[PDB]
Design a protein around this nucleic acid. Sequence first.
RNA 1: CUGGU
RNA 2: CUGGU
Lengths: 553, 553
Amino acid sequence: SQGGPQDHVEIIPLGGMGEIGKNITVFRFRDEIFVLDGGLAFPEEGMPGVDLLIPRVDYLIEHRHKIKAWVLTHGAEDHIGGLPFLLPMIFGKESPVPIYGARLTLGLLRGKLEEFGLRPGAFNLKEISPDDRIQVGRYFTLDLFRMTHSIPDNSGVVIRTPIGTIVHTGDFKLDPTPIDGKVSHLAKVAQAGAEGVLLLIADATNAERPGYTPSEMEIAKELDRVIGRAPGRVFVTTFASHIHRIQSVIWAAEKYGRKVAMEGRSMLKFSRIALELGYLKVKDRLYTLEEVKDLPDHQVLILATGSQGQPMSVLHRLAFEGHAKMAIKPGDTVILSSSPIPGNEEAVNRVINRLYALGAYVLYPPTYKVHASGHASQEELKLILNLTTPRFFLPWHGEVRHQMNFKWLAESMSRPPEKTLIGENGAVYRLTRETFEKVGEVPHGVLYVDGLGVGDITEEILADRRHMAEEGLVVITALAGEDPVVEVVSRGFVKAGERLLGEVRRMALEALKNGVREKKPLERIRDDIYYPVKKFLKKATGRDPMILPVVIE
Amino acid sequence: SQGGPQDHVEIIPLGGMGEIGKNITVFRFRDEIFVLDGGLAFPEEGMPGVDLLIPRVDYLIEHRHKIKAWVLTHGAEDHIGGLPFLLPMIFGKESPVPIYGARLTLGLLRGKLEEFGLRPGAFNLKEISPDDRIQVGRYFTLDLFRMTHSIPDNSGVVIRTPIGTIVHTGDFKLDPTPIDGKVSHLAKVAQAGAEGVLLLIADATNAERPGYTPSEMEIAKELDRVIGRAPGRVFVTTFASHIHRIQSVIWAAEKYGRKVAMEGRSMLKFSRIALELGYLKVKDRLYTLEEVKDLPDHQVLILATGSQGQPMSVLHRLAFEGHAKMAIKPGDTVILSSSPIPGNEEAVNRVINRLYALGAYVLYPPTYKVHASGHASQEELKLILNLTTPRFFLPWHGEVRHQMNFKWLAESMSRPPEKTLIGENGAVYRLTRETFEKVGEVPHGVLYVDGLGVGDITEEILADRRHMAEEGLVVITALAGEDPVVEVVSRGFVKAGERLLGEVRRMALEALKNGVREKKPLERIRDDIYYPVKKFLKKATGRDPMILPVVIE
RNA sequence: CUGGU
RNA sequence: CUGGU
Ligand SMILES: [Zn+2]
Ligand SMILES: [Zn+2]
């Protein structure tokens, strides 16, 4: 370690900037690298078929030997979910590199790795306290600090480098009454700010939300209020990783003499591990859907998936498609212990409307305080800003709107930062004792994943999938022979253009006759058919349908 | 007119039930019919290409001679927009049937009819007061009453029939301080309730919202607050039909010495008519975008479209695509004087993020009280329920969720209705002095409209457009000749299935060879190729792509 | 409770 | 801040 003008820390976010999911940040000093989380993202913007989204680790594959350790802040999908895809890409089916995480974080990763044909023993999973102090290589001293969020065992991290202090808040809220009674530890954060914070990296999710984010204890009381009032069966949907919320529901069920049943693999995965490691206390046991069937209504509570109106989720199956023993009977109580994520609003709305139609009482925010964001609002963020007083600021875990507002929030403070930068995935930020700026970019992006594997859906597949939905398809079949025949057919094409299909046959027949006379190859006849039919349809319908000219000898 | 068991009123909603748009209700007694509004609906659920949605008037086409009059409550698109398509379908390019509406309502319809190749003189447009009393045939006495909403000249209607009173609230809110100072007239409503209300049909939009909906005067003050604070140019987007909101913006511009410019044809249409009929007061004049260009920033205010993040709107062009003289310059103020409609949330979010990135200050609710719903909340609805005390209730202008809540709201009242029914488009409700029930259904649905005309996009076009986006396309070309050749190509198909394309060629070649040997017609060879390739791909990829087997001799 | 280079 | 008959 040393200092001066040549010494600097390089921060490279490969995901989680200008967005909410697939968090992965790269920290570099000299010839050493440390990675902060290996996240996953979810779709629904205009992407069909795609199940998951994983960041492009091209920088990590290239520098695979400089990686000294992988540090994980929490066990939620947008922080660990990407790893059983990123790990074999960077190291292969085994690695001695240390993977640091808390009991629940590594407990969840063990299950994730094991289900993908891997062995947890093949990778170096090193358990640490959420408040642990760890050394990474020769240049990084990582001081982890407990922070209240949606999942237990969630941490922030004070990154001590040879040029200055970097405070990373992680995903947080300043919940005074958490469900497990394990409060946010601000000592290290307050000690770091007193030493002096060179750079603060903070959760920007709710930088536009005024006030304070409600406690999980407040939500637990309102869930106990609504469950106790319910007449028959109770159906509760939440995000799968929300162990604390799952606890609040079980507490209520147990308080009213109800037996908890679980449906939906995502939520069954998180709970199995959580219960095993003492993160979920259940006075009785989690019953099967088969066992609960015979029980009377007022003694039944089913915890399930589908809080975002997902097509194959349990709540969707209950509303639309159908389920084995789970049918929405008139009089049922359905609590959506979540909020619609921007883009999944209509999917939640459709399911809610379908549920209501079946005789069920559908409970949800803002009408009933059944959900709180796991992220800090303005008052909690201002507290952190004042506790740290950083020289430089880098808002994270939010979109451009959320980042700009945290920038303004930091500028309205007594001692604002010297400069604030809006973080982008793939950017390379150079950090010295007195400077903080973008210096370049590294290969970045996303990889589309489905049940058939990683990269089974590409950018092209999706790009032309848009073309087909937006404008339609025109398939022209041309026979490059002695007797030429052109047959043109369509699917999802406007009736105005459908009327013009007869002219398309004649349009291509002309181009086919010229292709044979000149004895042009089939690859040149295609382009003699494509382009004129493209300009004809745009000038007659305004549309740009996907024109597929098939040329056979 | 008469009474007893055989006398009854038939209510047939052709649109506006179980939804928010395309309002059209049919009222029948004996051999006479009266229509309440001729609405239009907007898409964005999973419908590409589609511009507008118009109800299926198959009942009105069949009974075109029983129609005594067409009554219009307001000039908003979801109440009048459908008419320059429904009118030629029911009557033809001319009709002597009376079309009743207020000055603004008919003023807007005149413009709408005229732009579609019609003449306003060809139809019988009869101007009435928003508080007028009108006779329709021999059985209907229609008592219109002014109600505060988003557009001026908006009415409710007390429908007096030979069997009882039907109170229709229309689209409303109980705004104490409207922008034009033309308050809601509750006298007729209170008089009807004292006589006794047989059926109430009421606006259910905000039946889940507690309290009272804020006044347009409250929004005007907050818009004046934000415009006065703005440093440079001001960009304001609202819904086009919101004349009162457009007035509140002009008032603020004029208060700070700014000149108003207008871009976006939808908003240019409503304002031209409104200004002409004295519904919009502008101290100076609405300037062109060309004239305002040279003016300094703090003296520029541009009123535009794109409050729902619409692809070809002015605000979208400013953010994404591009505009002639309108570029988002860093320092600009952008006020989204609206709310995201469920389903258009991500479109608004994308535009907001794109705007922020360009250096603009983006203002919107809930952070700034720049928008109020034009619909009554719980307190206003309870007031109406108590003012009317109906024997029977029919919630309207809302989805199943909104309808169920109004049903509960009406059941928590001191004197609840005898029965409440959840209104569905195409249903036929029989109403007698002591009964109210569903008796049958009539041909109903929607028609997809675009710039190329009505029905240019069908249900099939959209249905197979989904197939193409969801799973992809497999085009198999088979040559039913002496020398058979099978060429299989794909677009938007999964790489797992793309790998299996070679086997598809062999799969169809087998079926082609059997088709020739048996001398089967080309229409039977297609099905010999289609079905086996369909079952093969589902058992190897799980996907159901659109298989297009093209057979040529 | 929506648009139309 | 999301799923997996
Ligand atoms: Zn997170
Ligand atoms: Zn309306």
